[PDB]
UniProtKB/Swiss-Prot annotation:
Gene name of the record: SPINK5
Feature type site, description Reactive bond: Q24, D25
Domain of life according to the entry: Eukaryota
Residue numbers of the full-length protein present here: 23 to 77 of 1064
Disulfide bridge positions per record: C8-C44, C22-C41
Name of the protein described by the UniProt record: Hemofiltrate peptide HF6478
Length: 55
């Protein structure tokens, strides 16, 4: 429920077995939703890199 457990909600689908390919179609930048997701993209990506430090 809280974003403190699943910060990546839409980008999650962009994860291929632990591989987050955020760089896909940022063209959405031409819109607010795109400007937003794109802002959460580069960020949602580092969210996965954090799991690599736990193990």
């Amino acid at each position: 429920k809280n974003e403190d457990q699943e910060m990546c909600h839409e980008f999650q689908a962009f994860m291929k077995n632990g591989k987050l390919f955020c760089p896909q179609d940022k063209k959405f930048f031409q819109s607010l939703d795109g400007i937003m997701f794109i802002n959460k993209c580069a960020t949602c990506k580092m969210i996965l890199e954090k799991e690599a430090k736990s193990q």
